[PDB]
Write a protein that binds this DNA or RNA. Structure first.
Ligand SMILES: [Mg+2]
Lengths: 325, 292, 243, 111, 34, 222
RNA sequence: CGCCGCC
RNA sequence: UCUGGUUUCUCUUCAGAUCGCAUAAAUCUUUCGCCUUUUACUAAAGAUUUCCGUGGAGAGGAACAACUCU
């Protein structure tokens, strides 16, 4: 939070290295996801020109995204039993439920794989299905984000068809992992990708006399006030609300200034939500200053981290993701 | 939530009841309503993740002790019926102590702690034997420091001399209820009731913190020092020294002992997949325990 | 003490504190320019010599003149002081040395020699026997009562400085650039070194105004009129032998 | 456009305002009003061409050195706010590109 | 400073200070009172 | 010599009643967030100002310098501005919002917000300005111990079966204003102390250490 | 967000 | 049954404390700002004092000290 990073920076400056240190404007780690499924199917190439893994990526539901995010399923279980878990929970298909392998980031992050939407037998020969090259290749290729080097989350990829090398000791057996990476998020970026900002749950306690001031100072910062609760005991009482972590900067100071020190708030990480806008958009004019309250602050919010440590812009799917021959 | 996710022993010491009653100035029955509400809310909040459905908390289980750290009072009834006992009681507490919460006492027929109100305005036993006498100590010391305070000191049997009675009203309060309540007996009896006093609750602990290790590490981590086991001691924290550049790490010992400069096999977060990629084994002959 | 002292012709004597690099005492009372100063090595006073005729005992911590040593008739070019009696030695521009009582203030013994003025005295610091400097005939004395031990050879410029090392070598620095090494024991003029000027200065501007050995006494470093500090060292040979 | 010069004119005009006031041994706020200076000599008085009462502009000081930002937060220039509104000198001086566009058409019409 | 700017030396220059706000700005939403 | 004084609580509660009209109703140092002395020390050290606070002169940290490639590499019109960094944020905690701070002090953080119902009526625990969501007269959802009023009288010795007090009530005339005086300002929560000089006591001094009430002229706020 | 006051 | 002292006045060193729940003036050393030169000045930093006061300590009385803490 703010105060944690304050005490970090104080101990960094005046205790552990007494050289003067420039800081930057605070900004959040933010995340990537998809909104609906694909509108085209992917394509592959290896240096042997041997593979063709064509596939898609579709969303999940947010509750099970939290579930696999919070170790509700574990990889140590029985294959049929975790299949039964996801089967009887998400009313999933029976043949595809047991077909899974290890999950997304850290094998815990909700970017799971299902091999078997489209029919059960193609190859199964030596690799033939995703065992170590594509699993660890996805691990190596899901922590480094596709669209603006920020992680995907709550988007699952399902392989539709593929092929093995003739003898992957001789031909490509370690030369399909970067193709696997490239294919998976090629299928991601064609599917209308979106970003996710974190929200903070904020709990205010505040006297009743200055309680519309907190409505104004979080409503200005895009805050959905959920619960105003007169509490027993304290005449001051609680507000519970949601604010973006990019608009939480100087929050409790602003709140505590407008209420002349009577109100007080605390702030904690809630689950991620969708920024108003699309990263893929072009013909979209971003003034350098003047923050957007607009429905297109997401394009700003991603180009201004590609303008950072970043990459080059213009992420339309022609060059590194696809091949219009 | 993070504690029962680690299934630790969730006991509770709710605090600032002086701030409940010197400051919000609640009548005793409504103070009981607030405390019953807050214990019911933490009970219904613990029973949101019901792997331990039997485990609830109440004062009668010796599971919650009230307090005021401003004036240093321990409270709870298993320790308070001791102060009923050592002066003028001969009560034989912990059956009397587990009887005063949520049931109504009445003065004739000398005791039947009913489920009903004998008189149409009958305060409970918690707001006739324990809470409202605390009100009378507290209100008579911060309202009547000149009159009626030697009467309540003569009744409570606390002599207190001319120098220490000339204090300001807040330190005088802290001293008078410190000499009344004595020592923190409620906080240690709340820990006889729970907090499983290790090698007894060590099984979910060593299960959750270690990765398995049955027949190699599990049975010896369940054991104590008795110096035949491994060393195998955890370390989560790293305090600074006064000069700052020296760090002193800090953690719990589970089965073993360190004396005088033992070579120390320092594991790491990903140094040991099955074996140490690095240790940099250390020789440390100073280590000592911490207070504030 | 952790502070240095300074004095110059602005009539000012200052106590530069070294922990802050700033003036803290700023002594006052000299009626003309201020030439030399020296610290008593044991107690905390400060003896200063001027152009008017006098020398003063400033009390450090009080910045109060304990004594004005009024016994000369012209400028007082230099002053050294020590722990053993006699305490203070003032060599002046009226051709005389005199040796003072630090307590009573009166002079113990004046030393009339030196047809031309004395401008440098130095003490040894192992045994007794200080030595004085003048254009005629650099001499050498002996501390209780003053006693003419010896005069030294013909270093015949108007000399400015004397410095002595703990192993008996002694450097006399003069106003025409020439500086003569000696020994304490005999009086044998040893080296007779005359240095050059650094490019801008004209030929007749070499002259030595200060010389001081190191605490190691391996380095002899002289402040000269050529706006230059010259730093000297030994030489590790054997065959420059005595005649 | 030169903001650093508009700070200088406010700084220098007030300094000769003050230099005349210390010649009277005055320096006082209302013992020497700005009627005295800005009244033309034909009535009497000193008669001086103001550029200080101008409301010198500002911008965001963080982002000032970075980028042409625009304009915010007019800073008050000379210390006179009672609604006298002494005229600038700049509005009686015909600007340059207007003067050259007059020059082109006037010599064209004259030929 | 409400937010950002002013003058660190009010006694250097021949002014009193008091930055206003630029009342001639053009945008969509600014206010706090109505 | 008139050096020391000890009063009694009626004698001081009447003085505390008489000494209004120049005594502040602030119960805690929570009105003074970013009007504290340490917030002002930080504002002095950082050349900036809280609105309505003092404006000092800069100190030895006058002019900074960064060459063009370096501050151009760190800071372009690249960063995600959402809402501006006000100076109250920098004075609040001057380390992550402010590069190179020194000679700087670090302010207090949220004293625990005393509520303290004030009184106008007898019967001390009047229980007002306070909701209560706990359902009265009908509740059980947890198991209680001793759910069996069965054991008759054996161990409640009637010599001291009684509570710790019944000889005096839980309230009287001078326990309302006593606990009102418990939360008093600085001279009036004492009951005892020393004697101050008559010029030592600042009267109009909690007054300026506040905000200015709005609707006041420019002369009185400067 | 409001310098200034002279022997 | 015996033990048995608060005020008030003068001296006697120690002060490490918001010695003071507030807060003066000076000197020095630098940077400011007005400035023509010098004192009157400006308003920041550093280090020093003076001054208006206080705290604990030895002694001498006198003040009901014989009321009585003990
Ligand atoms: Mg003259």
């Amino acid at each position: 939070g703010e105060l944690y990073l304050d005490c970090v920076m104080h101990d960094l400056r005046k205790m552990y290295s007494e050289i003067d240190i420039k800081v930057a404007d605070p900004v959040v780690t933010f995340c990537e996801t998809v909104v609906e499924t694909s509108s085209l199917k992917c394509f592959a190439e290896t240096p042997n020109k041997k593979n063709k893994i064509t596939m898609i990526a579709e969303p999940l539901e947010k509750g099970l995204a939290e579930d696999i995010e919070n170790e509700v399923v574990q990889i140590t279980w029985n294959r049929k039993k975790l299949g039964e878990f996801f089967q009887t929970k998400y009313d999933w298909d029976l043949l595809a439920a047991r077909s899974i392998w290890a999950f997304g980031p850290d094998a815990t992050g909700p970017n799971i794989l299902v091999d078997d939407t489209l029919p059960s037998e193609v190859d199964k020969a030596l690799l033939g299905s995703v065992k170590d090259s594509i699993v660890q290749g996805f691990q190596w290729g899901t922590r480094e984000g596709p669209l603006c080097d920020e992680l995907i989350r709550n988007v699952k990829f399902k392989i539709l068809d593929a092929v093995v090398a003739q003898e992957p000791l001789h031909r490509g057996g370690g030369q399909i992992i970067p193709t696997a990476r490239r294919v998976v998020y090629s299928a991601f970026l064609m599917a209308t990708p979106r970003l996710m900002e974190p929200y903070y749950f904020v709990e205010v306690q505040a006297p009743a006399d200055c309680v519309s001031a907190v409505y104004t100072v979080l409503a200005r910062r895009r805050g959905h006030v959920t619960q105003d609760a007169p509490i027993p005991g304290s005449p001051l009482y609680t507000i519970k609300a949601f604010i973006p972590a990019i608009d939480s900067f100087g929050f409790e100071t602003d709140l505590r200034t407008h209420t002349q020190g009577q109100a007080f708030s605390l702030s904690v990480f809630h689950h991620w939500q969708i920024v108003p806008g699309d990263p893929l958009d072009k013909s979209i004019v971003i003034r350098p200053l003047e923050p957007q309250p607009a429905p297109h602050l997401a394009r700003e919010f991603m180009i201004k981290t590609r303008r950072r440590k970043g990459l080059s812009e213009d992420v339309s799917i022609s060059k590194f993701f696809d091949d219009p021959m | 939530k993070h504690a029962v996710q680690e299934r630790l022993a969730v006991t509770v010491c709710i605090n600032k009841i002086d701030r409940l009653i010197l400051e919000l100035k609640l009548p005793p029955t409504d103070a009981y309503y607030k405390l019953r509400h807050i214990v019911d809310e933490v009970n219904g909040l613990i029973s949101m993740y019901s792997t331990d459905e039997n485990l609830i908390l109440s004062p009668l289980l010796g599971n919650v002790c009230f307090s005021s750290s401003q004036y240093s009072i321990c409270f709870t009834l298993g320790s308070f019926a001791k102060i009923y006992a050592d002066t003028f009681g001969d009560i034989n507490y912990q059956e009397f102590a587990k009887r005063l919460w949520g049931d109504i006492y009445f003065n004739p027929k000398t005791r039947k702690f009913t489920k009903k109100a004998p008189t149409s305005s009958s305060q409970r036993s918690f707001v006739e034997f324990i809470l409202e006498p605390l009100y009378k100590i507290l209100a008579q010391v911060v309202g009547d420091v000149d009159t009626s305070l030697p009467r309540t000191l003569d009744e409570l049997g606390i002599h207190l001399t001319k120098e220490e009675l000339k204090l300001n009203i807040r330190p005088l309060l802290r001293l008078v209820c410190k000499k009344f309540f004595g020592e923190f007996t409620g906080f240690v009896d709340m820990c006889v009731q729970h907090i499983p006093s290790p090698k007894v609750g060590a099984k979910p602990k060593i299960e959750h913190t270690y990765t398995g290790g049955v027949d190699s590490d599990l049975g010896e981590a369940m054991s104590d020092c008795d110096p035949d086991g491994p060393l195998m001691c955890h370390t989560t924290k790293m305090y600074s020294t006064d000069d700052g550049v020296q760090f002193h790490a800090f953690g719990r010992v589970l089965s073993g002992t360190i004396h005088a400069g033992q070579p120390v096999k320092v594991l790491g977060e990903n140094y040991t997949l099955e074996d140490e990629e690095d240790s940099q084994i250390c020789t440390v002959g100073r280590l000592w325990i911490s207070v504030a | 003490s952790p502070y240095l002292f300074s004095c110059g012709e602005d009539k000012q004597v200052k106590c530069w504190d070294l922990e802050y690099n700033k003036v803290i005492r700023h002594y006052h009372g000299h009626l003309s320019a201020v030439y030399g100063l020296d610290l008593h090595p044991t107690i905390d006073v400060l003896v200063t010599c001027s152009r008017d005729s006098t020398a003063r005992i400033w009390d450090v911590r009080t910045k109060a003149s304990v004594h004005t040593l009024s016994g000369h008739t012209n400028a007082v070019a230099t002053v050294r002081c020590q722990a053993a009696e006699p305490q203070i030695i003032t060599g002046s521009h009226d051709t005389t040395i005199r040796l003072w009582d630090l307590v009573a203030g009166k002079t113990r013994v004046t030393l009339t020699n030196h047809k031309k003025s004395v401008r440098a005295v130095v003490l040894h610091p192992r045994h007794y026997t200080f030595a004085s400097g003048s254009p005629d005939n650099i001499k050498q004395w002996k501390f209780p009562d003053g006693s003419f031990i010896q005069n030294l050879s013909g270093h015949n410029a108007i000399i400015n400085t004397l410095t002595v090392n703990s192993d008996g070598v002694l450097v006399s620095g003069a106003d025409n650039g020439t500086m003569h090494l000696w020994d304490w024991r005999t009086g044998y003029n040893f080296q007779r070194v005359h240095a050059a000027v650094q490019p801008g200065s004209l030929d007749s501007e070499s002259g030595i105004f200060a010389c001081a050995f190191d605490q190691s006494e391996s380095r002899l470093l002289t402040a000269e009129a050529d706006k230059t500090i010259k730093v000297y060292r030994e030489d590790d040979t054997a065959t420059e032998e005595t005649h | 456009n030169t903001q650093e010069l508009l700070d200088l004119l406010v700084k220098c005009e007030n300094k000769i305002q003050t230099r005349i006031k210390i010649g009277l041994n005055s320096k006082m706020p209302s013992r020497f009003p700005p009627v005295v200076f800005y009244t033309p000599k034909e009535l009497g008085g000193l008669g001086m061409l103001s550029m200080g009462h101008v409301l010198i502009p500002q911008s965001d000081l963080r982002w000032s050195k970075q980028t042409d930002v625009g304009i915010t937060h007019f800073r008050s220039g000379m210390s006179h706010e009672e609604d006298q509104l002494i005229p600038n000198l700049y509005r009686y001086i015909q600007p340059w590109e207007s003067e050259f566009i007059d020059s082109q058409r006037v010599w064209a019409e004259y030929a | 400073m409400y937010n950002g700017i002013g003058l660190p030396t009010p006694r250097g220059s021949g002014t009193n200070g008091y930055v206003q706000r630029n009342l001639s700005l053009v945008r969509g939403r600014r206010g706090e009172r109505p | 010599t008139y050096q020391r004084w000890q009063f009694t609580l009626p004698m001081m509660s009447t003085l505390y009643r008489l000494a209004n009209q120049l005594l502040t109703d602030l119960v805690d140092d929570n009105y003074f967030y970013l009007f504290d002395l340490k917030a002002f020390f930080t504002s002095k050290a950082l050349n900036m100002a809280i609105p309505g606070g003092p404006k000092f002169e800069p100190l030895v940290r006058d002019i900074n310098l960064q060459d063009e490639d370096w501050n151009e590499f760190n800071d372009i019109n690249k960063i995600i501005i959402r809402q501006p960094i006000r100076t109250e944020y920098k004075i609040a905690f001057p380390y992550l919002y402010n590069n190179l701070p020194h000679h700087v002090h670090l302010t207090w953080y949220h004293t625990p917000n005393v509520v303290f119902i004030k009184t106008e009526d007898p019967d001390l625990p009047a229980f007002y300005f306070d909701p209560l969501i706990n359902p009265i007269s009908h509740r059980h959802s947890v198991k209680s111990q001793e759910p069996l009023p069965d054991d008759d009288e054996e161990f409640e010795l009637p010599e001291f079966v009684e509570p710790f007090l019944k000889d005096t009530p839980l309230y009287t005339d001078n326990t309302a204003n006593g606990i009102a005086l418990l939360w008093a300002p600085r001279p009036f929560n004492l009951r005892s102390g020393r004697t101050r000089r008559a010029l030592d006591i600042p009267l109009v001094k909690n007054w300026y250490r506040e905000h200015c009430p709005a609707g006041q002229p420019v002369k009185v706020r400067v």
